Design a protein around this motif. Structure first.
Motif, PDB file in Angstrom:
ATOM      1  N   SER A  58       1.456  -1.540   0.113  1.00 49.09           N
ATOM      2  CA  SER A  58       0.085  -0.514   0.050  1.00 49.09           C
ATOM      3  C   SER A  58       0.621   1.155  -0.235  1.00 49.09           C
ATOM      4  N   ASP A  59       2.104   0.848   0.107  1.00 47.92           N
ATOM      5  CA  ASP A  59       2.779   2.378   0.295  1.00 47.92           C
ATOM      6  C   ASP A  59       3.842   2.618  -1.320  1.00 47.92           C
ATOM      7  N   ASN A  60       3.265   2.329  -1.847  1.00 44.81           N
ATOM      8  CA  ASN A  60       3.340   2.854  -3.272  1.00 44.81           C
ATOM      9  C   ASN A  60       2.222   2.253  -5.062  1.00 44.81           C
ATOM     10  N   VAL A  61       2.658   1.803  -6.026  1.00 43.17           N
ATOM     11  CA  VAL A  61       2.128   1.819  -6.682  1.00 43.17           C
ATOM     12  C   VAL A  61       1.864   0.287  -6.901  1.00 43.17           C
ATOM     13  N   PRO A  62       0.847  -0.366  -8.145  1.00 43.58           N
ATOM     14  CA  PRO A  62       0.678  -1.962  -7.991  1.00 43.58           C
ATOM     15  C   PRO A  62       1.966  -2.134  -8.205  1.00 43.58           C
ATOM     16  N   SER A  63       2.053  -3.866  -7.711  1.00 45.25           N
ATOM     17  CA  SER A  63       3.311  -4.299  -7.273  1.00 45.25           C
ATOM     18  C   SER A  63       3.567  -4.965  -9.429  1.00 45.25           C
TER      19      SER A  63
ATOM     20  N   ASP B  74      10.935  10.173  -5.869  1.00 43.63           N
ATOM     21  CA  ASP B  74       9.689  10.631  -6.426  1.00 43.63           C
ATOM     22  C   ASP B  74       8.709  10.301  -5.267  1.00 43.63           C
ATOM     23  N   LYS B  75       8.881  10.083  -4.936  1.00 41.22           N
ATOM     24  CA  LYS B  75       7.948  10.155  -3.587  1.00 41.22           C
ATOM     25  C   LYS B  75       7.822  11.603  -2.568  1.00 41.22           C
ATOM     26  N   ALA B  76       9.038  11.700  -2.590  1.00 45.42           N
ATOM     27  CA  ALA B  76       9.942  12.973  -2.411  1.00 45.42           C
ATOM     28  C   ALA B  76       9.514  14.439  -3.299  1.00 45.42           C
ATOM     29  N   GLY B  77       8.918  14.506  -4.401  1.00 44.29           N
ATOM     30  CA  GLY B  77       8.550  15.641  -5.209  1.00 44.29           C
ATOM     31  C   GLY B  77       7.149  15.546  -4.825  1.00 44.29           C
ATOM     32  N   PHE B  78       6.391  14.183  -4.445  1.00 41.44           N
ATOM     33  CA  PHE B  78       4.809  14.167  -4.632  1.00 41.44           C
ATOM     34  C   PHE B  78       4.364  15.305  -3.005  1.00 41.44           C
ATOM     35  N   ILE B  79       5.080  14.921  -2.254  1.00 44.15           N
ATOM     36  CA  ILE B  79       5.177  15.525  -1.360  1.00 44.15           C
ATOM     37  C   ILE B  79       5.404  16.882  -0.891  1.00 44.15           C
ATOM     38  N   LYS B  80       6.481  17.355  -1.580  1.00 40.03           N
ATOM     39  CA  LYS B  80       6.897  18.547  -1.882  1.00 40.03           C
ATOM     40  C   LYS B  80       5.806  19.099  -2.569  1.00 40.03           C
ATOM     41  N   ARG B  81       5.288  18.440  -3.417  1.00 37.58           N
ATOM     42  CA  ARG B  81       4.717  19.590  -5.119  1.00 37.58           C
ATOM     43  C   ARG B  81       2.648  19.434  -4.521  1.00 37.58           C
ATOM     44  N   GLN B  82       3.289  18.900  -2.534  1.00 35.10           N
ATOM     45  CA  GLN B  82       1.999  19.220  -1.998  1.00 35.10           C
ATOM     46  C   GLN B  82       1.601  20.773  -1.350  1.00 35.10           C
ATOM     47  N   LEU B  83       3.094  21.235  -1.324  1.00 37.16           N
ATOM     48  CA  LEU B  83       3.409  22.789  -0.619  1.00 37.16           C
ATOM     49  C   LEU B  83       3.588  23.835  -1.427  1.00 37.16           C
ATOM     50  N   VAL B  84       4.446  23.225  -2.860  1.00 40.40           N
ATOM     51  CA  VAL B  84       4.876  24.539  -3.757  1.00 40.40           C
ATOM     52  C   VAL B  84       4.267  24.998  -4.806  1.00 40.40           C
TER      53      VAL B  84
ATOM     54  N   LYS C  11      19.527   9.911   0.872  1.00 45.44           N
ATOM     55  CA  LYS C  11      19.902  10.774   1.368  1.00 45.44           C
ATOM     56  C   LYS C  11      18.113  11.821   0.747  1.00 45.44           C
ATOM     57  N   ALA C  12      17.692  11.088  -0.477  1.00 47.14           N
ATOM     58  CA  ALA C  12      16.770  12.121  -0.719  1.00 47.14           C
ATOM     59  C   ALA C  12      14.919  11.942   0.970  1.00 47.14           C
ATOM     60  N   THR C  13      15.499  10.785   1.583  1.00 41.80           N
ATOM     61  CA  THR C  13      14.798  10.975   2.701  1.00 41.80           C
ATOM     62  C   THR C  13      15.195  12.280   3.416  1.00 41.80           C
TER      63      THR C  13
END
Length: 1322
Positions: free
Chosen positions: A847-852, A892-902, A992-994
């Motif tokens: 559930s933490d990503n896209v279909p396996s 990728d999962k970092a832009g998705f959560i960055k683009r929630q604020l920019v 380091k993305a984390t």
RNA sequence: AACUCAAUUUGUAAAAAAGUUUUAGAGCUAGAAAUAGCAAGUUAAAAUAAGGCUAGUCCGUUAUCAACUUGAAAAAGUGGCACCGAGUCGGUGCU
DNA sequence: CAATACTTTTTTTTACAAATTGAGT
DNA sequence: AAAAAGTATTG
């Protein structure tokens, strides 16, 4: 020192001013008018409301249809003018009667019977010809002479309703028998394929090709009777041609590119001739018998009923309908009486009832007629033969219907042409005009030429070759269709951003393509054994590679570059290339395109024809109509072979570049004289490129570019909804005013936030066709049920699961899940584009990503098919399969959560630019920008979460203050965030993305006190949050959570509704029958509504305060009045031009001209006890007060409604801890309604209904009480229900009271007022 | 900033089929009369924002609008600051 | 006057251009 | 495609 927060929307603009202490100041304000108070205290927060902006669509859609009305009109004027002379010798009253056919006998200027002019000759006509189509078949089959007027009728009828131009080419009458035209095809096919004939023995072609079935199904059904033949076989493709499809003949003939054919396009002729010039004229007799089939199938696809071969098949068909309609009606009447006399009245008489009466004389849809009368015929006996006629929609057919929208103009023409071919022997002026008349029917203004204006149309680009009045005959000799056809596109095509006076080249200009190659090439490097350092290609090397390679290969590979050039030319056994991988991305594809056509490299490489080829590519890119292209290229007919020219007008180019000629090979640098492309060709050893060239201050390119070059005009040219452009515009004037309110002192930060059936039917309907699933028959539906998300998905997924290869049972959707493809933990997108229906949302995998990847590798083929049927999007498909392309990486999962604020959105970046440009206008020594103000951009997540995180819940239904609260908090959160993390002035401010993940995930933590992270830890940031670098305090969690809590409790918030003169249509569009009321509007000057009918319900532009006198009583004595008069949109210009003459014409005497006050809609009056009312029209009002409901009830209402972390008890217990807030709220509402709403009748039904449901659960009352604010909401009395007790609205239906009230002229912020006592007038 | 593909949104033009409104499709018998019994019914002309001047086979429902002064118009110009408090804004002091 | 209840134009096709977003490069 | 004004008839 202050700052401004703004919240931008479609129907609202909230605003707030704050200080460095996060407080909103207040000021005294000079008050104007005749009132006593010359001052008032107001808080520098508020909002602005206004009705939505509208797209220029309906405005256009009407206009476009006006031109159709103003041209069908002339198609008759053209036809009458012809008949005019020879018509006079028969009846010099005829045409005059057709005009006044509409007028009543009491007003007609000739005899009242239109066609002949007595009544015994007319009645006999309607008995020989019950319908016009009877006159149509007659005027064709019969040979005898015909009455000239009868003729004009049949001709104009075909001209007034000519049919559609969706089919090109002529249709041949003689083409009529399917069963025989099919057989002559099989025989024609067999002639060339004697080895493999086709046994059409016992194949009912007329059954399969003429059925009322889908084109595709007819094909599949026809091929199914030919064991041996394939769907995409030749014969298959050929029938596909006959049925109206566009098949492909590549595979059948082993050709290169795809060769498609459609018998309806203008290209079939030339596209076939391109094919026969490729397979041999041996097949010419084949693609013709296929056409003759199409010409017979079209008919069977047009006529509802089959009939005897004639020369008027349409007109004969409708006769067979009238005859059947007549036949089946005689039956029904007698049938009904003999079995249902209890009804015959209601059916054939009562127009209110959807029986045969209301069918004809009422307004009963053919659908409404069947839907009602069907069970009757089911009850009776002997009706079964008519139930069929019903279910195929052939029961009592009218002849002028909706289905007649399929009839192409060719059908009508074959009849108009016949009638002329009959009576031209008797009447000789016909034959003289047989072409002239048919041109009127066939003529059609091309879309790419436009309105036939003469300088008075901002919609026009047409260029007149002659000067005279354009006619359907001289159009070619008066209109430069071509020079205009080029204008048509050149208007909409863009300019060169660097040279905003230069048009941009086509996407496929040889210059652009050369320019691309050098720009890519000038960056290649090479080095080999014996060289100190990797070198740059020189001018002499690049010109070689373009010649030896680029003009020889479309794609140029690195392997070629090494062993075809450095090896065979520079003698390099080995070499290393830097600056390009695998192969070049650039190509001279248009050059190879032409070389494959004109077959003369000497001509192409010749520098003299440079201008020619571009014009060829221009002509090819600039047009789309083959007739318009062949015309433009026949200038080069003397230059190329006819075979070439033919293969030349068949190439097409689509695209427009970003660059102009004058840019690359036009402008020059001063001390060098070289163009940009000249630089790309050679630049010593700097080998600079484009981006490097437009910038080097070392060169005279930068300065000459930046040497090139209103407000509301500047915004209308933005891209986006006109609604938001309205809100964007009103945002500035607010900021421009607030700056003035703050004594011209520019602020420091300006935080902005921007707010984010029939169609579904064809979508599924299409996709199912491409897959042939009988799921539609298996499970029929209705377009109003496709709103059920789950159900919409079952049909999108064709009833199978999207993660598991097994089916779904439609009956069990409630159990099945709706899974986010990309999970909302990353980006929110509750939209079909990111959702599917699966039995268990656990089969997607983790559930933490896209279909396996195990899912993709099993369901990809099914998904692909879902894309071939357009049942999913390429986007959806892209995300469904992201696993096998790496999945959603932790980066990728970092832009998705960055683009929630920019704010990624462009229109939002444009507002920030406009604001930053208006504020920051000062320049320093080194020509740098002095940034007095910093414009901040936020997404609505920051504040929507801030509320929930700190008990500042928003209930939109209480008032409109919450728009203003948002603009406040945006100033709060926006300023405080730049203070805390000033390093993010690059992602938030205009100019380091984390690590990134946990950063943007935990960025807003510093407001919180106790931080609980999901990996088990308590970390308490201190009470005061400070910046690391600067010493500024930014957030005292002791005061500033009450600084804000207090601001949201302020009861005075400037709510302003935009006063708007109403524009648009004159009235309701419905044309009403004659009644005797003074409220109907004349449809035409001389058309008394009491006699002819007319319009009703005019829309009011604005009202006017009219202090005057009227003639009262029999004595004609003057009685003073202070009435409020409504100016309708139609009456407007007449009134403004001279108002006094306008008013006295309505019975207004001694009008005080000085006190005529213009009152737009939403004009604001205040009365007793601070009650405010707004104007909707001359005699209707709206509530003008907001309810400053205390904050504690808001949060309680929020929580008691949203009863859905472990910190929920403290929230959920507070509810049952403060249940007494209910009756307190009901008193908050009431003691307000009694004061400014005055719906005592309705207020009872609330107090009677709340009490009646006190026993109900705390949540169910919590909700239904939010509904009660409808009674108190600013604006128009609406209806609402409490539990199931509807409360219809109480309307303020007299404006008489505001005439002795107080007018309030509000600034855009409501701060600057002007108060007018309307009691001091008169 | 490029390229490719797809989707959305905006804007313009060319077309068609409806819908409605008045008139034309002689309604007949009975009865003083309203009322009854029968008969019929599908089509057509014309208008389709009133209309405007610049008179075109053109233009007429989008955009833009508090009040006041100034302007043809676009648009410009016009209203003191601090503290305390708060039911739609009060009160106080200062120039 | 206040209450009440009813109505409000619609469907389809062809052709073009521009942003803008969103996913692959 | 509803909001809500215009219209008419009734208490």
């Amino acid at each position: 020192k202050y700052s401004i927060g703004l919240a931008i929307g479609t129907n609202s603009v909230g605003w707030a001013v704050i200080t460095d202490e996060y407080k909103v100041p207040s000021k005294k304000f000079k008050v104007l008018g005749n009132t006593d108070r010359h001052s008032i205290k107001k808080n520098l927060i508020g909002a602005l409301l206004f009705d939505s902006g509208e797209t220029a669509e309906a405005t256009r859609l009407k206009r476009t249809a006006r031109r159709r009305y103003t041209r069908r009109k002339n198609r008759i004027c053209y036809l009458q003018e012809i008949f005019s002379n020879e018509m006079a010798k028969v009846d010099d009253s005829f045409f005059h009667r057709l005009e006044e056919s509409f007028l009543v006998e009491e007003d007609k200027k000739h005899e009242r019977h239109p066609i002949f002019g007595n009544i015994v000759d007319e009645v006999a006509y309607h008995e020989k010809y019950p319908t016009i189509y009877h006159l149509r078949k007659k005027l064709v089959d019969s040979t005898d002479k015909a009455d000239l007027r009868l003729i004009y009728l049949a001709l104009a009828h075909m001209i007034k309703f000519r049919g559609h131009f969706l089919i090109e080419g002529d249709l041949n009458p003689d083409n009529s028998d399917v069963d025989k035209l099919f057989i002559q095809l099989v025989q024609t096919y067999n002639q060339l394929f004697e080895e493999n004939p086709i046994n059409a023995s016992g194949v009912d072609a007329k059954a399969i090709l003429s059925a009322r079935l889908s084109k595709s199904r007819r094909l599949e059904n026809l091929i199914a009777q030919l064991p041996g033949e394939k769907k995409n076989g030749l014969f298959g493709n050929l029938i596909a041609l006959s049925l109206g499809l566009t098949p492909n003949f590549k595979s059948n003939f082993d050709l290169a590119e795809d060769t498609k054919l459609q018998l309806s396009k203008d290209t079939y002729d030339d596209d076939l001739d391109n094919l026969l010039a490729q397979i041999g004229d041996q097949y010419a007799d084949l693609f013709l018998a296929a056409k003759n089939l199409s010409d017979a199938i079209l008919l069977s696809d047009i006529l509802r009923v089959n009939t005897e071969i004639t020369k008027a098949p349409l007109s004969a068909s409708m006769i067979k309908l009238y005859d059947e309609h007549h036949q089946d009606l005689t039956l029904l009447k007698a049938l009904v009486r003999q079995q249902l006399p209890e009804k015959y009245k209601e059916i054939f008489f009562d127009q209110s009832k959807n029986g045969y009466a209301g069918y004809i004389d009422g307004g009963a849809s053919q659908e409404e007629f069947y839907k009602f009368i069907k069970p009757i015929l089911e009850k009776m006996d002997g009706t079964e033969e008519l139930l069929v006629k019903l279910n195929r929609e052939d029961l009592l057919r009218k002849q002028r219907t909706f289905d007649n929208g399929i009839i192409p103009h060719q059908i009508h023409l074959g009849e108009l042409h016949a009638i002329l071919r009959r009576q031209e022997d008797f009447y000789p002026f016909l034959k003289d005009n047989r072409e002239k008349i048919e041109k009127i029917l066939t003529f059609r203004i091309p879309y790419y030429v436009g309105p036939l204006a003469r300088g008075n149309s901002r919609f026009a680009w047409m260029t007149r070759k002659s000067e005279e009045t354009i006619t359907p005959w001289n159009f070619e000799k008066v209109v430069d269709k071509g020079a205009s056809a080029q204008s048509f596109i050149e208007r909409m095509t863009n300019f060169d951003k660097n040279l905003p006076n230069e048009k941009v080249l086509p996407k496929h200009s040889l210059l652009y393509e050369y320019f691309t190659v050098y720009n890519e090439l000038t960056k290649v490097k090479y080095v080999t054994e014996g060289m100190r350092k990797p070198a740059f290609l020189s001018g002499d090397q690049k010109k070689a590679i373009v010649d030896l390679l680029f003009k020889t290969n479309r794609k140029v590979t690195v392997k070629q570059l090494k062993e075809d050039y450095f090896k065979k030319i520079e003698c390099f056994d080995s070499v290393e290339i830097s600056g390009v991988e695998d192969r070049f991305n650039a190509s001279l594809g248009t050059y190879h395109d032409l070389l494959k056509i004109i077959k003369d490299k000497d001509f192409l490489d010749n520098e003299e024809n440079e201008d020619i080829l571009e014009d060829i590519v221009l002509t090819l890119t600039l047009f789309e109509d083959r007739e318009m292209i062949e015309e433009r290229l026949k200038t080069y007919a003397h230059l190329f072979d006819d075979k070439v020219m033919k293969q030349l007008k068949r190439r097409r180019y689509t695209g427009w570049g970003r660059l102009s000629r004058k840019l690359i090979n036009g402008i020059r640098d001063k001390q060098s004289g070289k163009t940009i492309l000249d630089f790309l060709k050679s630049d010593g050893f700097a080998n600079r490129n484009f981006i490097q060239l437009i910038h080097d201050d070392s060169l005279t390119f930068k300065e000459d570019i930046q040497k090139a070059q209103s407000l509301h005009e500047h915004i209308a040219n933005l891209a986006g909804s006109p609604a938001i452009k309205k809100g964007i515009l009103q945002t500035v004037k607010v900021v421009d005013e607030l700056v003035k309110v703050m004594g011209r002192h520019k602020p420091e930060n300006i935080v902005i936030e921007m707010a984010r059936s029939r169609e579904r039917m064809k979508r599924i309907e299409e996709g199912i066709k491409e897959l042939g699933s009988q799921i539609l028959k298996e499970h029929p539906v209705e377009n109003t049920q496709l709103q059920n998300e789950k159900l919409y998905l079952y049909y999108l997924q064709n009833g199978r699961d999207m993660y598991v290869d097994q089916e779904l049972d439609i009956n069990r959707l409630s159990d099945y899940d709706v899974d986010a493809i990309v999970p909302q933990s990353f980006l929110k997108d509750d939209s079909i584009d990111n959702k599917v229906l699966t039995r268990s949302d656990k089969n997607r995998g983790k559930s933490d990503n896209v279909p396996s990847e195990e899912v993709v590798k099993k369901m990809k083929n099914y998904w692909r098919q879902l894309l071939n049927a357009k049942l999913i999007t390429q986007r959806k498909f892209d995300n469904l399969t992201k696993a096998e392309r790496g999945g959603l990486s932790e980066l990728d999962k970092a832009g998705f959560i960055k683009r929630q604020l920019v704010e990624t959105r462009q229109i939002t970046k444009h507002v920030a630019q406009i604001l930053d440009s208006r504020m920051n206008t000062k320049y320093d020594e080194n020509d740098k920008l002095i940034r007095e103000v910093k414009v901040i951009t936020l997404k609505s997540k920051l504040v929507s979460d801030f509320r929930k995180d700190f008990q500042f819940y928003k209930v939109r239904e209480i008032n409109n203050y919450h728009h203003a609260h948002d603009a406040y908090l945006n100033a709060v959160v926006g300023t405080a965030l730049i203070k805390k993390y000033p390093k993010l002035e690059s992602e938030f401010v205009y100019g380091k993305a984390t690590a990134k993940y946990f950063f943007y995930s935990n960025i807003m933590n510093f407001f919180k006190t106790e931080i609980t992270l999901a990996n088990g830890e308590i970390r308490k940031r201190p009470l005061i949050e400070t910046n690391g670098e600067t010493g500024e305090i930014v957030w005292d969690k002791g005061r500033d959570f009450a600084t804000v809590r207090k601001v949201l409790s302020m009861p005075q918030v400037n709510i302003v509704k935009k006063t708007e003169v109403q524009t648009g249509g004159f009235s309701k569009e419905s044309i009403l029958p004659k009644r005797n009321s003074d409220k109907l509007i004349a449809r035409k000057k001389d058309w008394d509504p009491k006699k002819y009918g007319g319009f009703d319900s005019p829309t009011v532009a604005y009202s006017v305060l009219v202090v005057a006198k009227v003639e009262k009583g029999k004595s004609k004595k003057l009685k003073s009045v202070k009435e409020l008069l409504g100016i309708t949109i139609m009456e407007r210009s007449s009134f403004e031009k001279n108002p006094i003459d306008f008013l006295e014409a309505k019975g207004y005497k001694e009008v005080k001209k000085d006190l005529i006050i213009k009152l737009p809609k939403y004009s604001l009056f205040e009365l007793e006890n601070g009650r405010k009312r707004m104007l909707a029209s001359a005699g209707v009002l709206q509530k003008g007060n907001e309810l400053a409901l205390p904050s504690k009830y808001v949060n309680f209402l929020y929580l008691a409604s949203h009863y859905e972390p472990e910190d929920n008890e403290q929230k959920q217990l507070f509810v049952e801890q403060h249940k007494h807030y209910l009756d307190e709220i009901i008193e908050q509402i009431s003691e307000f309604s009694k004061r400014v709403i005055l719906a005592d009748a309705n207020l009872d039904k609330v107090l009677s209904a709340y009490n009646k449901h006190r026993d109900k659960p705390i949540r169910e009352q919590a909700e239904n009480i939010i509904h009660l604010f409808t009674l108190t909401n600013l604006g128009a009395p609406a209806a609402f229900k409490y539990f199931d007790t509807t409360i219809d609205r109480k309307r303020y239906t007299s404006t008489k009271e505001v005439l002795d009230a107080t007018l309030i002229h509000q600034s855009i912020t409501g701060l600057y007022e002007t108060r007018i006592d309307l009691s001091q007038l008169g």
